[PDB]
C-alpha cells in the first residue's frame with residue numbers, strides 16, 4: 001500500500017509531527033510511506049518576516065493524491081478549522097471528486113494548536129471534506145495509552161494526534177505527543193495494507 | 198463478516214430505512230446481516246398515546262455489539278442530534294469502551310428528519326461517538342448518483358443515507374432514498390467482507 | 395432577566411461547575427439566577443450502586459424553560475456528545491419548539507470529561523439543538539485569562555467552561571476551571587440583562 | 592448599529608444571497624448595512640478561465656471588521672467547509688483576535704451548495720471560528736415558515752439561509768430562499784439595534 005503524509009506547517013510543529021506519523025507508518029512492512037507538504041499561499045517575504053520555518057519536504061500536487069491508498073492529513077488549527085493553505089489545496093480536488101478518484105481511500109487527520117482550544121474541531125471539520133470524497137475515515141480511539149495520562153499538559157485526542165505549540169510557539173512536541181503520532185501512522189498504514197495489500 | 202443494522206425508530210421511517218440497508222448488505226456474498234432496535238426509553242403508555250409504531254425487530258443489548266464486524270446505526274434526528282434512545286443505549290457501552298470491544302470495527306450511519314434540517318449534523322455528531330470507540334467510519338460520498346438529483350425533494354447526503362418524513366410523518370421513504378440506503382448497506386458489507394472474510 | 399443554570403451530573407463535577415456558573419451570574423445586578431437539574435433516567439438502584447452523587451437542586455420540567463431569558467446548559471460528555479439524561483430532557487421540548495417558546499433566548503454550554511477528549515464536541519453538538527430552537531448561542535472566547543495558561547492540565551475552551559474529572563473521577567474542579575466557569579455565568583447574565591432588562 | 596454582510600462568491604449565488612441579506616437588514620430602523628467581498632485567492636487568469644463572475648462589492652480588509660456591531664458571513668461550501676478564500680481571509684484576523692476586536696459582536700452565516708450536501712456543516716464549522724473570536728452566534732431557527740415547505744427543492748436550515756445552485760450552477764436562488772435570507776438580515780440587524788442602538 002502507498003501512504004501519503006500530507007501536511008501544512010508554518011512554524012515546524014506539524015512538520016515534526018508528520019515525521020513521527022511517517023516513522024510509525026514505516027513500521028508496517030507492506031507500507032510505502034511518502035511525506036509531502038501543501039504549497040505555501042502567503043507571499044514568501046511575509047512568510048519569512050513572520051519567522052516561518054523552511055521545509056525540505058517536496059510539494060504535492062492535488063492530482064497525485066489519487067496515487068495513494070491512504071492519506072494522513074496534518075494541519076495546524078486556525079480558529080478550530082484547518083489552515084487556509086490546506087483548505088486552498090483541497091479546493092483544487094474537484095477533478096478528483098468528479099472522477100471518484102479518492103473514493104474508498106483511507107483518510108486520517110492530525111493537528112496542532114497554541115493553547116489546545118479547537119484541536120478537536122479542526123480534526124472533525126477536516127473529516128467532513130474527506131467524507132465528500134467518499135474516503136474512509138480513521139480515528140485513533142484510545143489505543144494510544146498516553147491518552148489516559150492527565151498528569152502533564154498534552155495534545156492527542158481519540159480523533160487524531162495533536163500537539164500543543166504554546167502561545168508563542170516555543171513548545172516542541174512532547175514524547176507522549178510524538179508517541180501517539182507514531183501510533184496513528186502505524187494503525188492507518190496497517191489498515192491500508194489490510195485493505196489494499 | 199457479520200453486519201448489525203442497529204436502529205431507533207418512533208413512527209417507522211428509520212425502520213423502513215433499516216430494512217433497506219439490511220437488504221443492500223444481504224446482497225454481499227459472505228455477509229451475515231442482522232437488524233435490531235435499541236430499547237424504548239419513554240413510558241410505554243406515552244409511546245403508545247403519541248402513536249409510536251410497534252416493531253418486530255428484537256431489542257439489542259449493549260454487550261452484543263462486540264459480536265459484529267460492522268454496525269450501521271440508524272437514528273431519527275432530535276434537533277440535529279441522535280435520539281435520546283440511541284444516546285441512552287450508547288451511554289451503556291462504557292464496558293465495551295474499556296475493553297476495546299468495538300475498536301477497529303466498521304461503523305456507518307443513516308438518519309431521518311421531518312423537514313430535512315439537522316440531517317447532516319445528526320450523522321456527523323454520531324460519528325464522534327463512534328470515534329471514541331476507535332471504530333472505522335464509513336461515509337457514502339457521491340457514489341449513489343441519486344445524490345445529484347435536485348429535481349425532487351430527496352434525502353441522502355455524502356455522510357449517510359437519509360429520508361424526509363414530512364412535518365407530520367405522512368411521507369414514506371421514496372425509491373431514490375431507499376436506493377441510497379441499499380447502496381450504504383451493500384458498500385459497508387462489501388468492506389466488512391474485504392477486511393474480515 | 396431570569397437566568398437558568400440547567401445541568402446534569404452523575405458524580406458531582408458538573409454540579410460543582412454549575413454552582414460556579416450561578417455564582418458568576420449572580421454578580422450581575424439585574425440577573426435572577428436559578429439552578430435546576432434534569433431528571434435522572436437511570437434506575438435509582440443502579441445509580442446508587444454506581445456511586446452516583448445525591449443532589450439538592452430542584453428538578454426542572456421541560457415547560458419551565460420558557461420562563462427564562464437565558465439558559466446555561468451543563469452536561470458531562472458521553473463519547474463527545476451530551477449525556478442521555480440531557481438529550482432525553484431536550485427531546486421533550488417539541489411543544490416549546492412548535493410554539494417558538496425559546497426563540498431568541500440566550501443559550502450557553504459547559505462540560506466535563508474524564509481525560510479531556512470530546513469536551514469541545516460536547517459543547518458544539520449541544521449548540522446544534524439550541525439552534526433548532528432559534529436560541530442565540532453564547533461562546534466565551536478568550537476573555538477568561540486562564541485559557542492562555544498551558545503550565546497545568548486544565549479544562550476550559552473558547553466554546554464554554556469545562557473541567558477534567560480524571561479517569562476515576564477523583565479530580566475536583568481546579569481554581570482555574572471554576573474561575574472560567576464564573577466568567578461564563580457573568581458574561582451570559584450580563585448579555586441577558588442587556589437584551590431583556 | 593452597523594451591519595457588515597461579508598461574503599465570498601465565485602459564480603454569483605452567494606452574491607445574490609448577500610444582497611437579499613443586506614435588503615432585509617436595511618429594513619431595520621437604526622441599522623447601517625454594508626456589503627463587501629473577501630479577496631480572491633486564485634490567480635486572476637484561472638478565476639476568469641473557470642468563469643468567475645465579476646462583482647461590484649468592494650474588497651474587505653481584515654482590520655475593518657472591528658468597525659461593525661454585527662457581521663453576517665456568506666460562503667459557498669467546499670466539501671462541507673467554508674471556501675479557501677473565506678478561510679484565508681479569516682486566517683488574517685489574528686491581530687483582531689489578540690486585541691478582542693470582535694469579542695461580543697453579533698455573527699451569523701449563510702451558504703450555497705451545488706446539490707445541497709454540506710450546507711449545514713459549512714455553517715456550523717464557520718460558527719467554530721466565530722466562537723474563537725467570542726462573537727455572539729445567531730441561528731435563524733424555524734421563524735422563516737418556508738423552512739416547513741417540503742413541496743419543492745429549497746435551501747435554508749435553522750443554522751442560516753442557504754441556496755441550491757445546481758450541479759453546474761444554472762439554478763438561481765428561489766423566492767423562498769431569498770425570503771429566508773432577507774429574514775436573516777432583518778433578524779440579525781434587529782438584534783444589533785436592540786444591543787447597540
Ligand SMILES: NC(=O)c1ccc[n+]([C@@H]2O[C@H](COP(=O)([O-])OP(=O)(O)OC[C@H]3O[C@@H](n4cnc5c(N)ncnc54)[C@H](O)[C@@H]3O)[C@@H](O)[C@H]2O)c1
Pocket residue numbers: 011041042046049050051084085114165166167168169170679682683684685686
Ligand atoms: N504562534 C506560533 O506557533 C509561533 C511560532 C514561532 C514564532 N511565532 C511568532 O509570532 C509572531 C506572529 O504571530 P503568528 O504567526 O502566530 O500569528 P499572526 O496571526 O499574528 O500572524 C502571522 C502573520 O501572517 C499572516 N497570515 C497568517 N496566515 C495567513 C494566510 N493564510 N494568508 C495570508 N496571511 C496570513 C497574518 O495576517 C500575520 O500578519 C511572529 O512574529 C513569530 O515570530 C509564533
Ligand SMILES: NC(=O)c1ccc[n+]([C@@H]2O[C@H](COP(=O)([O-])OP(=O)(O)OC[C@H]3O[C@@H](n4cnc5c(N)ncnc54)[C@H](O)[C@@H]3O)[C@@H](O)[C@H]2O)c1
Pocket residue numbers: 208238239240243246247248281282362364365366367482485486487488489
Ligand atoms: N411526526 C410524526 O412522524 C407523527 C406521526 C404520527 C403522529 N404524530 C403526532 O404529532 C404529535 C407530536 O409529534 P412528534 O411526536 O413528532 O413530536 P412531539 O415532540 O410534539 O411529540 C412527542 C411526544 O412524546 C414525547 N417525547 C418524545 N421523545 C421523548 C423522549 N425521548 N422521552 C420522553 N418523552 C419523549 C414528547 O414530550 C411529546 O409528548 C403527537 O401528538 C403525535 O401523535 C406525529
Ligand SMILES: NC(=O)c1ccc[n+]([C@@H]2O[C@H](COP(=O)([O-])OP(=O)(O)OC[C@H]3O[C@@H](n4cnc5c(N)ncnc54)[C@H](O)[C@@H]3O)[C@@H](O)[C@H]2O)c1
Pocket residue numbers: 285288289290291292405435436440443444445478479508559560561562563564
Ligand atoms: N467516572 C467518574 O467521573 C467516576 C466518579 C466517581 C466514581 N466512579 C466509579 O467508576 C465506576 C463505573 O464507571 P462509570 O460510571 O464512569 O462508567 P460506566 O460506563 O462503566 O458505568 C456506570 C454504570 O451506569 C450505566 N449507565 C451509565 N449511563 C447510563 C444511562 N444513561 N442509562 C442507563 N445506564 C447507564 C452503565 O452501563 C454502567 O453500568 C463506578 O463504580 C464509580 O464508583 C467514576
Ligand SMILES: NC(=O)c1ccc[n+]([C@@H]2O[C@H](COP(=O)([O-])OP(=O)(O)OC[C@H]3O[C@@H](n4cnc5c(N)ncnc54)[C@H](O)[C@@H]3O)[C@@H](O)[C@H]2O)c1
Pocket residue numbers: 088091092093094095602632633634637640641642675676756758759760761
Ligand atoms: N458550478 C458552477 O456554478 C459553474 C458555473 C459556470 C461554469 N462552471 C464550469 O464547470 C467547471 C468546474 O466547475 P466548478 O468551478 O464548480 O468546480 P471545479 O473544482 O472543477 O473548478 C474550479 C477550477 O478552479 C480551481 N479552484 C477552485 N477553487 C480554487 C482555489 N481556492 N484555489 C486555486 N484553485 C481553485 C479548480 O482547481 C478548478 O480548476 C469549470 O470548467 C467551470 O467553467 C461551473
Ligand SMILES: Cc1cc2nc3c(=O)[nH]c(=O)nc-3n(C[C@H](O)[C@H](O)[C@H](O)COP(=O)(O)O)c2cc1C
Pocket residue numbers: 008009010011012013014015076077078079080112113114115116117118165169681682683684685723
Ligand atoms: C490565524 C491563526 C489562528 C489560530 N487559531 C488558534 C486556535 O484557534 N487555537 C489555538 O490554540 N491556537 C491557534 N493558533 C495557533 C496555531 O494553531 C499554532 O501556531 C500552530 O498550531 C503551530 O503549528 P505549525 O508550527 O506547524 O505551524 C492560531 C494561529 C493563527 C496564525
Ligand SMILES: Cc1cc2nc3c(=O)[nH]c(=O)nc-3n(C[C@H](O)[C@H](O)[C@H](O)COP(=O)(O)O)c2cc1C
Pocket residue numbers: 205206207208209210211212273274275276277309310311312313314315362366484485486487488526
Ligand atoms: C424531540 C424532537 C425533535 C425533532 N427534531 C427535528 C429536527 O431537528 N429536524 C427535523 O426535520 N425534524 C425533527 N423532528 C422530527 C423527527 O426527526 C422525525 O419525526 C423522525 O425522523 C421520523 O422518524 P421515525 O419514524 O423513524 O421515528 C423532531 C421530532 C422530535 C420529537
Ligand SMILES: Cc1cc2nc3c(=O)[nH]c(=O)nc-3n(C[C@H](O)[C@H](O)[C@H](O)COP(=O)(O)O)c2cc1C
Pocket residue numbers: 287288289290291329402403404405406407408409470471472473474506507508509510511512559563
Ligand atoms: C457512557 C460514558 C461515556 C463517557 N465518555 C467520555 C469521553 O468521551 N471522554 C472523557 O474524557 N470522559 C468520558 N466519560 C467520563 C465522564 O465524562 C465523566 O465521568 C463526567 O465528566 C463526570 O461528570 P459528572 O461528575 O458531573 O457526572 C464517559 C463516561 C461514561 C459513563
Ligand SMILES: Cc1cc2nc3c(=O)[nH]c(=O)nc-3n(C[C@H](O)[C@H](O)[C@H](O)COP(=O)(O)O)c2cc1C
Pocket residue numbers: 090091092093094132599600601602603604605606667668669670671703704705706707708709756760
Ligand atoms: C472545490 C469545490 C468543492 C465543492 N463542494 C461542494 C459540496 O460539498 N456540496 C455541494 O453541493 N457543492 C459543492 N461544490 C459547489 C459549490 O458549493 C457551488 O458551486 C457554490 O455554492 C456556488 O456559489 P457561488 O456562485 O456563490 O460561488 C463545490 C465546488 C468546488 C469548486
Ligand SMILES: Nc1ncnc2c1ncn2[C@@H]1O[C@H](COP(=O)(O)O)[C@@H](O)[C@H]1O
Pocket residue numbers: 143144145146179180182183186
Ligand atoms: N499493537 C501495538 N504495537 C505498537 N504500539 C501500540 C500498539 N497498540 C497501541 N500502541 C501505542 O502506540 C504508541 C507508540 O508505541 P510503539 O509502537 O511501541 O513505539 C503508544 O501510544 C502505544 O501505547
Ligand SMILES: Nc1ncnc2c1ncn2[C@@H]1O[C@H](COP(=O)(O)O)[C@@H](O)[C@H]1O
Pocket residue numbers: 537538539540573574576577580
Ligand atoms: N470585566 C471582567 N470582570 C470580571 N472578570 C473578568 C472580566 N473579563 C474577564 N474576566 C475573567 O473572569 C474570570 C473570573 O474573574 P473574577 O470575575 O474577577 O472573579 C477570570 O477568568 C477573568 O480573567
